[model samples]
Target chain A: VHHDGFQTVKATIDWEHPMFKLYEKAKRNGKWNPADIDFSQDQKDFASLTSEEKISALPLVAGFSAGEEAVTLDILPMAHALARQGRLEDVLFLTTFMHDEAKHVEMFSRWQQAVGIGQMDLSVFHNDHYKRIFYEALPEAMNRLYADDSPEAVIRAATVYNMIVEGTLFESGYYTFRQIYKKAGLFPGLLQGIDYLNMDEGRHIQFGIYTIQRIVNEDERYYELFIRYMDELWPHVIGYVDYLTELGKRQQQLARTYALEIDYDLLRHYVIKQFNLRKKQISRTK
Target chain B: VHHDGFQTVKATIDWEHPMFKLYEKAKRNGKWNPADIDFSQDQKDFASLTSEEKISALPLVAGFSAGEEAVTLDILPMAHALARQGRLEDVLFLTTFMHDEAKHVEMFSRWQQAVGIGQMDLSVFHNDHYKRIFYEALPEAMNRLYADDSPEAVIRAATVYNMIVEGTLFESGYYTFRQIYKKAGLFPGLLQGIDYLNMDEGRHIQFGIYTIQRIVNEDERYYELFIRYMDELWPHVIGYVDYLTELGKRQQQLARTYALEIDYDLLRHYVIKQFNLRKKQISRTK
Candidate 1:
């Protein structure tokens, strides 16, 4: 309310700003559509999978579907928060970020139906960590922006939505997806969707880092909020990994079917590794 | 707040929906950059413009620049309102609507500076109608969505934003820009930007019409809100036309300068014609 970025921009532009650059990049690279991707072949692949393979795959597909749904739904408040702060570039970059999330939720849903994987309640497949973050912490942090858009609130949100949800859990899910399907030569539609998702999430993660860096650089007190929220969600972040591990372990019949098994230890390591790398960047922010 | 559209969409997509169709068309057709367009020729052509011609041009440029700023800033709440209504398709389509408004603000601002038309108070050029709609009515209707978001609030906003600020005034401004430059073969960059803008606003106007139709279709009581708001804004809309007519009349030295002047009578005719066409569509929304 104090000032409008649009008013300021009526005379000037920060062409070199990363937020602005990321917006343009998304305009180019993230233009792919969910409806355009064919799932006919993916349906054929799904028909070939055993009951056990379908069960194992359903957890992954459902996890992402529900999480992406939460993401697209919850993301509005954070965007509202940024506009309140008059961070036009941040909000500009986020506009497509939400669009891609809508696309992701749509793609996963379509893929499920195309493969005839319909269920009355897909939430039956959601794990405890999935509910806690996607349902509880994520929405709380994001919805808080409606009342409070202070540095702490924004950091709490970016940490949960971008860093933890997408960076830690979703990134690991992408790895698991590729490990299972990429090597197996199955579900080109699913792989194609994730590939586009990966490019989109790259911009998303970059935005989270930049926002945290901008907030911290403005005041040192905000530094610990990212660390605090990140650590706060640490249990569930790893809980998500363990849940996936247990789901796979129960569905461990994959070795006989495709000679493929999810390596829980390596997957855990990947989650930890990715988490620390993101945390270190937050720590190293001056 | 209600059941999330994303959750519903995790199992369904309304492919036939006009909102979804508009959202997709924007993805493919509305992808353009203000920075990519070369204003080098525009600058050269601008130097050839007479002092009177340049003076004549700045009001049009500044009016759109400041009006667009107000638009981009005020639009977020309507998007929020759609989300609160649990209209995922509406919110999903609006995500890019805000983005293009942001781009328009950026392009006009960039174009102004590209031609060295910098002014300390671009607002000094604003007419009473310009300020009334852009500063008061538009923001009041749009910002009201943050607290209200009732059908009335949404109708008030769509009528003000999509119908008045964009459809009537912005559309008229685009027509004026063509009169000034396109025939004269001047400022191709500005024309190109407005051309892109014209396409983007096609979707924008379509959305405004659809929002009103949806609201009116839901209940007969809501039908009068569009007619009411449109009439409420009629004085200011006509006031805007008269202000431009006088500005051009005062600057009527164009006969010797370029031997052309703004078609004030024709322009006023255009505003009425366009408003009636839009109003007739709303009337027939049954």
Candidate 2:
């Protein structure tokens, strides 16, 4: 029912806008499809692994696939909000975001089927910490946009979505995948997916920062609130490290399992590092 | 927030689904960015046009840009509806559909700026029939999907959106523009816009038909509802042609215009042919 920006401000679309730049980046980098990924090497790598090694890796795969679906499903309200605001460049780039999220789901699913785990219920791998964000917090922040697209709500949604869910949780997870998996040199195909996914997420993180910066220009209250929401979610954010480390510890019990000797503190530090870097970007918008 | 297909059926996604096919086609065909299309010659073509010739073409440019913008704004509910249904492939394809529509809006806007029309308010060229559909009926039907994704409501959306709006209304103009512009050799950029627009809509119409077929398979009575809804909007459908033709007539008085000696009955026949063909495709789902 909301009047869109087209009727009123179509001509005023700013091509120099940061979001449009993100859109151009997404369009170019997003050409790699899930289908183009040859998982045969991944399938062979999985076949060579023992059951314990496979089970150790299942959480990594499941958590990400589930998160992919979470973002794909729950992320729409931001697009709806941008559409409602007639933020055309943001909305246009958002379709790429939505596409990449859904494509991530497909990539992870294809990986599962490749690794012989698609037949299993991986939701069991989703710890309570995962549920709090993906199940409860993520959708609430996103869905609130339908009723409220105020700068406060948008900042909160971005904090939970881009800063926490993507930046803190996913970026750390991918770094772990890159670090631990690179040490082992396993699953070339899956790692390739992570490479492309990380590329996509780079632009996505840029989008979240730029959008928050836009609103920060409008009101510094939202800038502070953005950091405030990040603070509120830190406990659960730390919980992702706790639970993921717990799984890595469980994998260590099997010793012969693809030794996932993750530096627990290293991941925590990385999360905090990415978190501060993103926050610095937001406040600096002033 | 509706639960997405990912939670329930991420593993069960049907890759063979028609909607997925549309998405694949979109992904392959969508690399053609709006900025890639050249409008320099089209801009020069406008210089050669007489004032009356330029005015004669105003409705074509304005009407299509506004329609592009209208669909970009109003079409989100269908995407939301599919997401709510957990139709993953359809939802995935719907993102491409949205990207294509928004890109269409950009291409048209670019054409306007290229051909010297973006500086003016083009909504004045949108006739009464256009307002009733673009302003009122389209949003009501699409937004109703938020409240109701019932087969009847979805079918109603397809009727207004794909059947009447895209299939009958825009198709008629594209045909008219193609004939006249192709003959006059004017506005290659604008004609190129129509070419891509036509191709994108081919996928959109396919999505519409396949979507309707899915619901029709649920109940032939929904098929009945679908046809009746199209019947309801057929008047406004013809009204677009009527108004555009009236403009053409006004241009005819000026002489030395683009001389759009369009076959009025020919357009009417094309409209009926498309309408019945779409309706018949739905009934065939039985």
Candidate 3:
């Protein structure tokens, strides 16, 4: 191992950059006014707003809550993992992400209630599948990533499962909301929120790539295993693309007014770009 | 939906198949004749051995002892779902799968102990990720499949997760041993044991596919939602594939002496293929 002559390899610090600041600001003020926010009176009045508007309204209005939930639920476990590893800076970063997610959940709940769509429950069957896929598989996978005795294994697993997959996978589906916001010409606030979430995810992506590079440099064995894992796991990634495409199609068919035009360019760019970028990073480490 | 003009669809039973009968017979009479089953000598002498001679020389192996644990951990929930749905026949089928999975644990454990591989502690890790994924998300997905009113949610969930993923996902890796039996005369007894388990899995797989197809046909709304759920849950599926492949690779590398070659084919051909077939079947129904 070659040590760059620096006195110390400054330990990496990835902060939970999403909703932490907003959440803290809100908490300090001890007040929030949902009524102050107005999406658009120009894009047809509320009553005439069609089901598309009704469903699209969900993310736009609930962006605050959703972003919060997204950050907390998505980021907290990693924070916990960092804490276990005694990486205090990274732990603090994720602590903020956890808080942000919780706040977003709270905010979304409030807005949903106001919009009269608050009472909608996840379809029991659909919800069950989501639970198994995320809750069951993620933990086991994360456990392997974290519990791996070597830093090389941990880094490889985390890089693959968390950073690249999580950051890139959700983009197309998420962009649907952005498209809606763009159509209405009134999504600066929601976009701001998503932008913040995306920023945190960006940092995670970098760290993941960095981690992969470090792991591969440390051990050829991990590199080989990761390559093999990717080969096997890629189908599911493709399956996800098919899944979203189908979903976008269904959304269009059932209610054309509500469906955002599925952008093939955007999806292809994200998935393929991420794949290539990660691959390059891995090879560079070699 | 065409009912095939029958009072009840009497699906051909996989459990009643002769392959399973051979397994049961072999289990009851299988011997661990170390004198005859010399791995060192057998590798060279296999061609000369008679069928009966070969059968007696194989190692006596057992399945994991957690099958009953699975019943408690997994099946009870499934049973509750079945009882709720009033699907008496399907419920009975689960009752049998549970018995088989549980017996597998016992038989595998016994065999492992008999061969000195069972001494490792079978400690359970009660992590939140596992609980949330298995208990929370899985049941929810099943509920969507059954329109939120079916009692068989647990069973359906288990069939998807435990029997299909665990059974079939692990099968390809297990097949390597069987392959050795045919090619190199290695671990023939262990192969026999896996062949036994695979027999049971065939039934479980059939039941799962049958249930999924029936649900899709019975209600278009449910079918659509189920499809959507599958799409949403693709990440978890990918996670599963990643985990299994990683474990399989590690097992092969670490247990090199065991010469375990994980049958990626089993996962692709048996598990994933079965899932795709069911998906297509549902599409046809729609």
Candidate 4:
């Protein structure tokens, strides 16, 4: 940490590191506009789906539409914390992170509008589990940075934001979407947008893991706090996962006529593997 | 105010308003790199100056160097405020604002290094007035949004940022620099960078003025708060203005030998006119 407050050149991360590399990659490859994606096929794809299939997909889309907006709004505090600490590289990377989230929100919204569900009230999709993570927990943990900028606060915020929200729930959701849409041969434009979103998120998650490890390496107590936050958030993660799985199961029966493979067990395994990998990586930081 | 939280498409200012137009202009025009500017001539210009001339020039450079970094760091809070309100276009414009400030900081730093003044102890230039405005008051007012997201807090933050700091001090300083350097026929590279900085800041001040007016128009009390904050900050603005004028006077004696015109009264008048125009525009919001 440079006590001088500001530096002409950033010293936190170099080009060799993944964080800087990822930021540059984002600038180079992540320039797609939501308005430009051809959604005419998406409109036809939605019209061809059964009512039950539409019902199943609507909740998932609703959750994501709301979730992306939540992340975009909530990520500002962490950027503020990084700026206050004069971490220019981290601030630079986080700007792309916030911008990506806004783009994701816009992409999801455009899809909804194209599919003719733009005006649907998504409140029904905000289950207790979803609200617990996004509504109550995410903001509470992030807003904690305003009062307490300790490593614990930052680590906890990252745990909810990166580890559970993006790392676990969003990743799992995206995987399921890719499988379902690809198997059903539906919504190529939505899938393309999701591919871009997944790539953007891969960088975000990598940066989050890097940031959490750095914080924990600075203070051992933050490592313990990291575990505690995950422990607290894990139950809600499971609850939301279960809700998504239940929705998937109901959609699977309808999807069976289309010969779509809806394997809840595979999604569960994938999500668990992801969580454990993040936990192991975070634990190995020191 | 859109209570819908997040909108897929922005409905605020269109091509009719300067804020949107300037944002588009910045996107199209403000893409220069600091490394691209050739500063070899600037190095020679600084070395050819007398000791008194160098000393006089150093303080102005020092104050701006530090002030640019301060704005780069401090502007995050306002961006955070805009992000939370889900004003997509404003948030998009502010990302450029933050990026522009960072670019300005880098430009000044490159100039300092090229002129062999990079390692100078500029702490001596941070006079009481400069410290009051840049170091203490500016950050305090801007950072208040993290704790208090009231209309009053945002208004106060903008008042300090746009009305006083950028609108008064920076515009005045730039005008003085152009007059002095153009008259002396020196530091063309530095002057070019300052021209870019001025154009960038013109957009920022216009946006700030628009935002403050909109917010104050929401409630008449916010208009009063804007005036009170300006009234409070005007003294410190004058204090720093006086300090700069004193430095200019000393340099003016030496400049007289070269038949240069150094008018502190004219600079003061320029700054006052800029302030009153900003105040009048803000006052007429409702």
User: Model 2: which docking level applies?
Assistant: acceptable
Error of 1 at B250 (Å): 1.3
- The CAPRI quality class of candidate 3 comes to incorrect
Model 4 chain B worst lDDT run, 10 consecutive residues = B5-14
Model 2 off-target regions past 4 Å?
Answer: A2-12, A253-261, B2-5, B8-12, B253-260
Q: For this target, which candidate reaches the highest DockQ against the unseen true structure?
A: 2
- CAPRI classification of candidate 4: incorrect
Ranking by lDDT: 1, 2, 4, 3
Off by over 4 Å in 3: A1-47, A52-71, A74-77, A103-111, A123-133, A144-149, A184-189, A253-261, A264-269, A284-286, B1-286
lDDT of 3 by residue, A1-286 (tens): 1111110012111223332333233223322222233433422344466665454343223323322333333332343344344443333233333333332343334334434444454222122223333433444454453235366446545654554455445444356555655565544544444554454444445555555666678767777666665554555555555544554445553234534454655665667666555655566355
Model 2 Cα lDDT, one tens digit per residue, B1-286: 5333244223645668878777778888877787788999998988787777778778877778778877877777888778777777888788888888878877887777777766677677777777788878988999899889888888889888988889777887788778777887788887887898899898888888887888889877887788788898888877877887777776673234545566667766877787777777677465
Chain B, candidate 4: TM-score:
0.91
Instruction: For candidate 1, write residues B86-199 as lDDT tens digits.
Output: 677777788778888878877887787788865445666777777787767877787788789788888889998888778888887798779867877788888999999999
Q: Each candidate: what lDDT? A: 0.79, 0.79, 0.42, 0.76
